[PDB]
Design a protein around this ligand. Structure first.
Ligand code: NAP
Ligand code: NAP
Ligand code: STL
Ligand code: STL
Ligand code: STL
Ligand code: STL
Lengths: 312, 312
């Protein structure tokens, strides 16, 4: 489309895919990053209200896709006031600036706003976050929707895609456990997950934006999710199957974990609202994960002691 | 050549170029990294003696080019025992393992081992480091040459090349000062520097390795440097000239700085020993820097307030 789009968090796992989607569909796509921004992207600290103000009013975007967030529970628990400032305050300020320029803001939220006791969750179901991250994401939605009426909230589950490091994604972190066949690996078989490709969420954003460019009623809360239900165990096995690797060493743990009280068992998102717009894309997990992980597939060759016990 | 080469610090500024040089010249090049290793390279902590031992004896390299180091004076001063462990202890252990496999080790050193009072410095001139970094690099040479007789030390000056971030290189960090023409910039015109392209140091490593594969006398201390003498000011102006940008805003400071007592004024390296082997390559600074920085050249376009005073 002949429109301008600004993508916050363009250096991140989802942001990279959102920027690619828009750009490849001939939008004037401008991406934002921070530590990893330059040279590919704009270096804008979302915590600096003036920088945010200046790039938005200079670029004059039609759409703003807000991906930038603190999603790491290690940083959200250790630095709770820095997490709130980025996941809540920065989003709210972005909504104020989106409103001033007349830009359609898409706030990216999480399935972690729900307690995962009563799936599937419809957009207008009561959120009950069991962790501070979900609470910051929930308070982020409230901040966005308070300061910008026409904004949209897109709730999505566990993401995977082309990663810079295996730790960039909760699905991709377990690749090494699957590759070290000599050592038994304990894998969660309790929490129900819906692995979603960032490529597919990026399509949903572009489509939603493109719908809004013709229909002013495209606003509010939306849910997007992959339709393949999987536990971390089933995922680990699916990864093994994709690469034709053994999964005999992988042990399922059906029991609720120690931190299980702070994690939603099944926060399944009902996607009927978006499906009502004809919006959506679903890359089969076995295809998507193979695309994502093949560079990290260790070719032993000369590496005789690489799979050694005291190495990871 | 039909030989195997292991490059430590392959993720770093110099390491990336050394690995490319060897690989492009049909060597069996295997690169090592740490935080940025995967998927392109091997993840080996040089501080873990077992990991170092295992990769060296598995790969059985003919040559080892040791680039990995703590070169940041901010980390060398704040964490002096972690800097010594990597710049000294890890190098020495690498020399012990190079010796055990019968691999030609090239230790990359610095012009900062000299006090820069009596240039040009010949390889057998007395080193006198004015800072802890230079002292760790000097003690690194001693560690290497003590534990491996046949090893080579390659002393090089200020490096530049294709950077991931402008901060990756002391030459490239000043690009933003050169680009912000609206603000006057104070540039050092005291310390004499010899900006050297990593591409050119990488050629010198390959050539030295290839010479050693036929001549067992290729060992000891060597010096490599670009032949263009420049102060940070002259460099900043040369960068401006390369891109056809004004340099009127750039102010030279001929006076010795506050930290000037800890920096060698002119640690010019005499390269006659390598020139005696027919070794060397010299990319003209104006060509080399243009290749290195063009991705970081800001195209204003819609970015009206990007060059604003309260932004950098
Ligand atoms: N990852 C999942 O599994 C998943 C599941 C549901 C929803 N989400 C939601 O998805 C959204 C997307 O993020 P992600 O998963 O792709 O996370 P991400 O990989 O962690 O990336 C985070 C992004 O935040 C940017 N950022 C952080 N601080 C910034 C600052 N001060 N100024 C400007 N930018 C800053 C980063 O920039 P630099 O790196 O350049 O510094 C990076 O681009 C998030 O809102 C998240 O809550 C995550
Ligand atoms: N840069 C200059 O201007 C210049 C001038 C003269 C000589 N030097 C000398 O040139 C050599 C090359 O380095 P550089 O300038 O290219 O520096 P660099 O960019 O700082 O890169 C340092 C490298 O060190 C690796 N490393 C650090 N800790 C490690 C560990 N614990 N295990 C394995 N690898 C580790 C890094 O890996 P990860 O990033 O993957 O973690 C990175 O590859 C250095 O020895 C330096 O002293 C520098
Ligand atoms: O390595 C990692 C650190 C944190 C995360 C976040 C995972 C996640 C999973 C969901 O169902 C919803 C959500 O908002 C976030 C993933 C990988
Ligand atoms: O304590 C340890 C025991 C074994 C190892 C194996 C290391 C290793 C790392 C590589 O990238 C390739 C390889 O062939 C071997 C490391 C540490
Ligand atoms: O951003 C930076 C932090 C540290 C450095 C190191 C510079 C340097 C310059 C020399 O003449 C010799 C040397 O060993 C190192 C460069 C850039
Ligand atoms: O305090 C401040 C005053 C001005 C600015 C300018 C920001 C900016 C950043 C971009 O990547 C593009 C742009 O057009 C403008 C930032 C902070």
């Amino acid at each position: 489309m002949n429109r301008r789009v600004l993508v916050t968090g363009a250096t991140g796992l989802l942001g990279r895919a959102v920027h690619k989607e828009f750009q490849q569909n001939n939008w004037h796509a401008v991406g934002c990053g921070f530590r990893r921004a330059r040279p590919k992207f704009e270096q804008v600290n979302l915590l600096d209200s003036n920088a945010v103000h200046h790039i938005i009013h200079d670029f004059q975007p039609h759409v703003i896709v807000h991906c930038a967030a603190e999603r790491r529970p290690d940083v959200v628990e250790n630095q709770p006031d820095a997490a709130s400032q980025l996941n809540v305050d920065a989003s709210g300020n972005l909504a104020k600036e989106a409103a001033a320029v007349g830009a359609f803001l898409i706030y990216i939220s999480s399935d972690y706003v729900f307690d995962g006791t009563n799936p599937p969750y419809r957009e207008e179901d009561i959120p009950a976050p069991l962790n501070l991250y979900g609470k910051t994401k929930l308070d982020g939605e409230k901040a966005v929707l308070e300061n910008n009426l026409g904004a949209a909230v897109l709730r999505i589950p566990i993401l995977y895609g082309e990663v810079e490091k295996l730790e960039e994604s909760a699905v991709t972190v377990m690749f090494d456990k699957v590759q070290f066949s000599n050592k038994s690996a304990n894998m969660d078989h309790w929490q129900q997950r819906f692995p979603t490709h960032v490529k597919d969420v990026a399509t949903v954003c572009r489509q939603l934006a493109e719908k809004r460019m013709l229909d002013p009623s495209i606003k509010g809360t939306f849910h997007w999710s992959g339709n393949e239900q999987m536990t971390k165990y089933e995922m680990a096995c699916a990864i093994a199957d994709a690469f034709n690797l053994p999964s005999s060493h992988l042990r399922p743990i059906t029991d609720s974990p120690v931190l299980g009280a702070q994690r939603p068992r099944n926060a399944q998102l009902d996607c009927s609202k978006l499906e009502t717009l004809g919006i959506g894309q679903r890359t089969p997990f076995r295809i998507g994960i193979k695309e994502s992980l093949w560079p990290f597939l260790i070719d032993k060759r000369w590496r005789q002691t690489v799979f050694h016990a005291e190495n990871l």
